[PDB]
């Protein structure tokens, strides 16, 4: 019911300039706003499909020659939104899921299908280095729920050959659980 | 029919004032922005003050100066940059250039409050010389400095 | 009235070594001291022109073959000093000014001219990646004040062709305001 | 009396997967667990030689083609363990020592000989960029103690030609001392 | 202490007079002939006359002009050529340049009767513009023309 927008610029200032412009262009929440190597700027916005489409259109139209890349993901799970902008609480210790995929695009799509195909809770989605670098999703819940989610996510990214590795970790060590929770 | 821009400043032995008017056709073409493509013509009035340290006579225009211009509308936040070209009109010689306001493709440079910042350099950059003799010599040229003025753009005149 | 000194070393240990030596050599405050990719060390000092000149001289003289680069910026606004080492308080969120330039040298000179050429308050100066990488200045104040400062800063960095982009943002979104502050 | 284990993987997910597996394989403490450029994963474990050997063996056997590098350092000072994972308490500011070496392996070996060859306290050992990048050791104590440690460490790394630079800084400035300790 | 060269001429809305004096040191160096290498400094005084057709105000100096100089001694037949550079002195802005006379390696440029010919071109050649609007426009720039003066060199002053 929601949509995720991604915009990459070659200028840090223009990224911030477009950030203010896009937020004012429509009713959308800022998910990510940071500089990427070597000197690019990455912006991520969330909200309704209509608002996101207009915001992405406005941003690209004013990006000029500084535009690196742009993408709009429609029909995305709402649990994915705060998982990207921050972290969802992982009170469950029964099982933890981790799925790493190439590019944030593949990771987002895998998580969306995973969440809709199970009863597991998506903990967080982390981008190690930009929208083109390795990205990973974190799920939590019952052992059966986590496995189903991981399987669904692996199939999505695997169909495009963008799947890096998958692992289901039931009863995680106290030291490993903390790193997973704080990561 | 010239519109004054802010208050004039007196420094480096020269008076620096800014004014805007209707677009003009300058020769040769292919340099200054087309009159039909512009909304206003910005001109910088530079005359030497009394007892100028560059040996310049009072009232005489300051030539061979390198002057860039920056106009930003505080309402929209839009900012543009350009250079002023030396030219002659019926009202004498000055640095002027046609600038698009309402007709600006980027927009945001319409009617409202605007701030002008000019960057002026020494004429030595343009190959202008200066005597340094005991009898007819003059003082050193002013270091590069910026001036700020505030004015409200009422639209194309 | 103040001066900024910059020293870059190729060794992390020597950088720390040069830091203690320089600080004891004269009355100067440490603005920046961190390791940069792939294994260099960046040091930034602030203070009087006399003190900064002596400190930079001492550091370079003891740097040896580990010296990467050095630079001294005289006649800089005092508001620029804490803007690099940290952030100045912004009681107003009404409008923000941002000017990004290539290399910290151009950004520093632009910020100095901006503060001296307006009544706006300089929020912070950020170096994304080293003294040779993209750097940015942050200004805050009235809409008229911010525009003039940004315009002034744009001309300075633009004169060296190191200007990336300039933007004046009046009434920033609450989400954007937080990003600006952070 | 302790041992240090290092495992590097080419996949972030596999790194997290191997982390949980290694921790459950034996009684060892996780010293480091983070992603390294451009997309590798670094894991560091500490403990007894027997436990460390089994964990590293288990990790390597299941790493497959994703294995980047592995190393085991035996007979290491126990003060080195928390110095890598964190920072050791130093109530005294009288003298500080800094020794930068190529690769964390050389830095670790230098630190081990340093601690055993003096009465100085090892503050921390920092890896700037991976186990193969520039690493540095931090020592604290009496002027005579720090010098001996620095001399001892320099000889260790210098024998392999992996020593970058050594410096003894007695009575460090308040701004520099805090930065060195809190690094 | 300036020595006048012949009679001044009034044409193209500008007054053209010639004068000679002691050699001067001009900044930046490496452009004009060294003062120690020269014997006299020739300066061209160009001011706009009343009702100038280029919109130039009376008394104002003419800038951005391209002016070449030719000096020939009728006694020896020796002839040399050069260009005049725009510069500012204590007596205001003008076109001047240090020139070797007696110190000329080629010789023949000593004391005697000499004729001076200046070649002046339009300021459009140096990128100077001119308004052509109905309200503030001005007439076309004067075509390139030459002026001749005759004077007796009494030696380096």
Q: Does C46 touch chain D (CB under 8 A)?
A: no
Chains E and B touch (3+ CB pairs under 8 A): yes
Q: How many Cα neighbours within 13 Å face the side chain of B135?
A: 7
Contact status, residue A131 vs residue A8, Cβ threshold 8 Å: yes
Contact status, residue D59 vs residue D31, Cβ threshold 8 Å: no
How many Å apart are CA A29 and CA B46, to the nearest integer?
50
Q: End-to-end alpha-carbon separation of chain E, Å?
A: 8
Contact status, residue D4 vs residue D52, Cβ threshold 8 Å: yes
Q: Do C170 and B119 touch (CB under 8 A)?
A: no
Distance of CA A182 to the CA centre of its chain: 17
Q: Which two tokens stand for residue A24?
A: 């004012």
H or E element that contains D182: helix D174-182
Q: What is the torsion angle, in degrees rounded to the nearest 10, for the CA atoms of residue A58, residue A62, residue A67 and residue A71? A: 0
For B55, B58, D40, D111, the CA distances from B51, given in Å and listed in that order, are: 8, 7, 71, 73
Mutation target for C interface from A9, A13, A64: give the one with most C CBs within 10 A.
Answer: A13
Q: Do C38 and D129 touch (CB under 8 A)?
A: yes
Contact status, residue E132 vs residue E118, Cβ threshold 8 Å: no
How many Å apart are CA B102 and CA A26, to the nearest integer?
25
How many Å apart are CA A79 and CA A96, to the nearest integer?
16
Q: Do A12 and C164 touch (CB under 8 A)?
A: yes
Contact status, residue C90 vs residue C49, Cβ threshold 8 Å: no
Residues in chain A after which the backbone breaks (C–N beyond 2.5 Å) = none
How many Å apart are CA B104 and CA D47, to the nearest integer?
70
Q: How many Cα neighbours within 13 Å face the side chain of A13?
A: 26
Q: Which of E1, E127, E138 is nearest residue B88 as measured by Cβ atoms?
A: E138
Chains D and C touch (3+ CB pairs under 8 A): yes
Residue matched to tokens 């020794």 = D99
Question: Residue C79: CB partners within 8 Å, gap ≥ 6?
Answer: C88, C115, C121, C122
Tell me how many degrees the CA angle D22-D25-D30 measures, rounded to the nearest 5: 45
**Hey, is A161 helix, strand or coil?**
coil
How many Å apart are CA D83 and CA C83, to the nearest integer?
33
How many Å apart are CA C112 and CA D73, to the nearest integer?
52
Residues A133-170 as b/e (b if ≥16 CB within 10 A, e otherwise) read: bbbbbbbbbbeebbbbbbbbbbebbeeeebbbbbbbbe
Contact status, residue C80 vs residue C122, Cβ threshold 8 Å: yes
DSSP state letter for B109: -
For B136, B138, D51, E94, E102, the CA distances from B133, given in Å and listed in that order, are: 6, 8, 88, 15, 21
Question: Residue A23: CB partners within 8 Å, gap ≥ 6?
Answer: A30, A45, A55, C173, C175, C176
Q: Hey, which residues does B150 pair with through a beta bridge?
A: B115
How many Å apart are CA B119 and CA C146, to the nearest integer?
18
Q: Which two tokens stand for residue D121?
A: 């306290």
Q: How many Cα neighbours within 13 Å face the side chain of D158?
A: 9
For C11, C41, C95, D182, the CA distances from C38, given in Å and listed in that order, are: 10, 9, 37, 21
Contact status, residue E13 vs residue E51, Cβ threshold 8 Å: yes
H or E element that contains B48: strand B40-48
How many Å apart are CA B139 and CA A120, to the nearest integer?
80
Nearest to A125 by CA among A145, A164, A99: A99
Q: What is the torsion angle, in degrees rounded to the nearest 10, for the CA atoms of residue D163, residue D168, residue D172 and residue D177? A: 30
Q: How many residues does chain E have?
A: 157
Q: Taking phi first (over 0 means left), then psi (-120 to 50 degrees means alpha), and beta for anything else, what does residue C171 get?
A: left
Contact status, residue E138 vs residue E54, Cβ threshold 8 Å: yes
The sheet carrying A134-141 orders its strands as A121-127, A134-141, A95-102, A163-170
Name all chains with 3 or more CB-CB pairs below 8 Å to chain E.
B
Q: How many angstroms away from the CA of D132 is the closest CA of chain A?
A: 20
DSSP state letter for E39: S
Contact status, residue C73 vs residue C40, Cβ threshold 8 Å: no
Q: Give the chain C residue whose CA is nearest to the CA of B70.
A: C151
Question: Residue D107: CB partners within 8 Å, gap ≥ 6?
Answer: D99, D100, D101, D125, D127, D135, D136, D137, D157
Name all chains with 3 or more CB-CB pairs below 8 Å to chain B.
C, E
Strands (E), C113-161: 121-127, 134-140
Q: End-to-end alpha-carbon separation of chain B, Å?
A: 8
For D84, D120, D140, the CA distances from D88, given in Å and listed in that order, are: 9, 12, 10
Q: Taking phi first (over 0 means left), then psi (-120 to 50 degrees means alpha), and beta for anything else, what does residue E89 get?
A: beta
Report the DSSP pairing between strands B85-89 and E129-131. parallel
Tell me how many degrees the CA angle A101-A103-A107 measures, rounded to the nearest 5: 50
Q: Does D178 touch chain C (CB under 8 A)?
A: no
Residue matched to tokens 């070797």 = E100
Contact status, residue E86 vs residue B129, Cβ threshold 8 Å: yes
- Decide: residue B104, CB within 10 A, 0-12 exposed, 13-18 middle, 19+ buried: middle
Q: End-to-end alpha-carbon separation of chain C, Å?
A: 29
- Kindly report the backbone phi and psi dihedral angles of residue C107, in degrees, each rounded to the nearest multiple of 5, phi listed first: -65, -40
How many Å apart are CA B84 and CA B94, to the nearest integer?
9
- Kindly report the backbone phi and psi dihedral angles of residue D36, in degrees, each rounded to the nearest multiple of 5, phi listed first: -120, 150
Question: Residue D168: CB partners within 8 Å, gap ≥ 6?
Answer: D95, D97, D143, D146, D147, D150
How many Å apart are CA E38 and CA E102, to the nearest integer?
9
For A30, C19, C147, D151, the CA distances from B118, given in Å and listed in that order, are: 37, 41, 13, 60
How many Å apart are CA B35 and CA B103, to the nearest integer?
11
Q: How many angstroms away from the CA of C91 is the closest CA of chain B?
A: 20
Question: Residue A16: CB partners within 8 Å, gap ≥ 6?
Answer: A33, A41, C98, C167, C169, C179, C180
Q: Which of E27, E57, E64 is nearest residue B124 as measured by Cβ atoms?
A: E27
How many Å apart are CA D25 and CA E101, to the nearest integer?
99
Q: Give the chain D residue whose CA is nearest to the CA of C29.
A: D175
Q: How many residues does chain B have?
A: 157
Solved with = X-ray
Q: Do C100 and A29 touch (CB under 8 A)?
A: no
Name all chains with 3 or more CB-CB pairs below 8 Å to chain D.
A, C
The sheet carrying C95-102 orders its strands as C121-127, C134-140, C95-102, C163-170
How many Å apart are CA A8 and CA A40, to the nearest integer?
7
H or E element that contains C24: helix C12-25
Contact status, residue B57 vs residue E87, Cβ threshold 8 Å: no
Name all chains with 3 or more CB-CB pairs below 8 Å to chain A.
C, D
**Hey, is E63 helix, strand or coil?**
coil
Q: How many Cα neighbours within 13 Å face the side chain of C163?
A: 21
Q: Do D173 and C17 touch (CB under 8 A)?
A: no
DSSP state letter for C118: S
For A9, D74, D118, D156, D166, the CA distances from D112, given in Å and listed in that order, are: 47, 10, 10, 10, 16
H or E element that contains D137: strand D134-140
- Kindly report the backbone phi and psi dihedral angles of residue C161, in degrees, each rounded to the nearest multiple of 5, phi listed first: 70, 25
Residue matched to tokens 């027997």 = D50
Residues of C in contact with B70 (CB under 8 A): 151-152, 154-155
For A149, A172, C11, the CA distances from A143, given in Å and listed in that order, are: 10, 11, 50
How many Å apart are CA E93 and CA B129, to the nearest integer?
9
DSSP state letter for E31: S
Residues of B in contact with C117 (CB under 8 A): 117, 146, 148
DSSP state letter for E61: B
How many Å apart are CA D49 and CA D52, to the nearest integer?
5
Tell me how many degrees the CA angle E46-E47-E49 measures, rounded to the nearest 5: 130
How many Å apart are CA D3 and CA D52, to the nearest integer?
6
How many Å apart are CA E41 and CA E1, to the nearest integer?
12
Q: What is the torsion angle, in degrees rounded to the nearest 10, for the CA atoms of residue C49, residue C55, residue C61 and residue C66? A: -110
Q: Hey, which residues does C170 pair with through a beta bridge?
A: C95
Mutation target for B interface from E20, E48, E90, E129: give the one with most B CBs within 10 A.
Answer: E129
Q: Round the CA-based radius of gyration of chain E to a whole number and report it.
A: 17
Distance of CA A47 to the CA centre of its chain: 14
Q: Does C37 touch chain D (CB under 8 A)?
A: yes
Q: Give the chain C residue whose CA is nearest to the CA of B81.
A: C155
Report the DSSP pairing between strands E79-89 and B129-131. parallel
Residues of C in contact with A39 (CB under 8 A): 128-129, 133-134
Tell me how many degrees the CA angle C81-C82-C86 measures, rounded to the nearest 5: 135
The sheet carrying B66-73 orders its strands as B79-83, B66-73, B112-121, B145-153
Cis, bond preceding B28 (omega within 30 deg of 0): yes
Contact status, residue B61 vs residue E59, Cβ threshold 8 Å: no
Mutation target for E interface from B3, B41, B88: give the one with most E CBs within 10 A.
Answer: B88
Q: What is the DSSP string of A130-141?
A: SSSSEEEEEEEE
Nearest to C143 by CA among B154, B113, B119: B113
Q: Taking phi first (over 0 means left), then psi (-120 to 50 degrees means alpha), and beta for anything else, what does residue C47 get?
A: left
How many Å apart are CA D134 and CA D165, to the nearest integer?
11
Q: Do C147 and B74 touch (CB under 8 A)?
A: yes
Q: How many angstroms away from the CA of B119 is the closest CA of chain C?
A: 7
How many Å apart are CA E156 and CA A129, to the nearest integer?
76
């Amino acid at each position: 019911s929601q949509a995720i927008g991604i915009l990459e610029l070659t200028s840090i200032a223009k990224g911030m300039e477009l950030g203010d412009a896009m937020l004012k262009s429509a009713n959308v929440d800022l998910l990510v706003s940071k500089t990427i190597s070597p000197g690019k700027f990455l912006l991520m916005l969330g909200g309704d499909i209509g608002a996101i489409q207009q915001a992405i259109e406005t941003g690209t139209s004013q990006a000029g020659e500084m535009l690196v890349d742009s993408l709009v993901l429609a029909n995305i799970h709402p649990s994915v939104l705060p998982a990207i902008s921050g972290l969802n609480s992982v009170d469950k210790r029964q099982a933890v899921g981790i799925v790493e995929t190439w590019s944030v695009a593949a990771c987002i799509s895998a998580a969306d299908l995973a969440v809709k195909g199970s009863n597991v809770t998506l903990v967080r989605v982390h981008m190690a280095f930009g929208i083109g670098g390795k990205c990973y999703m974190v799920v939590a819940g019952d052992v059966l729920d986590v496995a189903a989610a991981v399987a669904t996510a692996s199939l999505a990214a695997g169909a495009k050959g963008l799947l890096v590795y998958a692992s289901i970790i039931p009863r995680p060590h106290e030291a490993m659980w903390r790193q997973m929770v704080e990561g | 029919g010239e519109v004054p821009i802010g208050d004039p400043k007196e420094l480096n032995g020269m008076e620096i004032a800014a004014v805007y008017l209707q677009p003009i056709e300058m020769e040769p073409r292919g340099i200054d922005l087309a009159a039909s493509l512009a909304d206003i013509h910005l001109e910088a009035d530079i005359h030497a003050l009394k007892n100028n340290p560059n040996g310049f006579p009072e009232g005489f225009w300051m030539p061979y100066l390198t002057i860039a211009y920056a106009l930003a509308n505080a309402d929209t936040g839009a900012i543009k940059t350009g250079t002023l070209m030396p030219m002659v009109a019926d009202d004498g010689p000055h640095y002027g250039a046609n600038i698009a306001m309402e007709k600006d493709k980027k927009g945001g440079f319409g009617v409202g409050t605007y701030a002008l910042t000019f960057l002026i350099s020494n004429p030595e950059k343009q190959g202008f010389g200066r005597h340094v003799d005991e009898e007819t010599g003059v003082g050193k040229w002013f270091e590069p400095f910026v001036v700020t003025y505030f004015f409200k753009y009422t639209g194309t005149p």
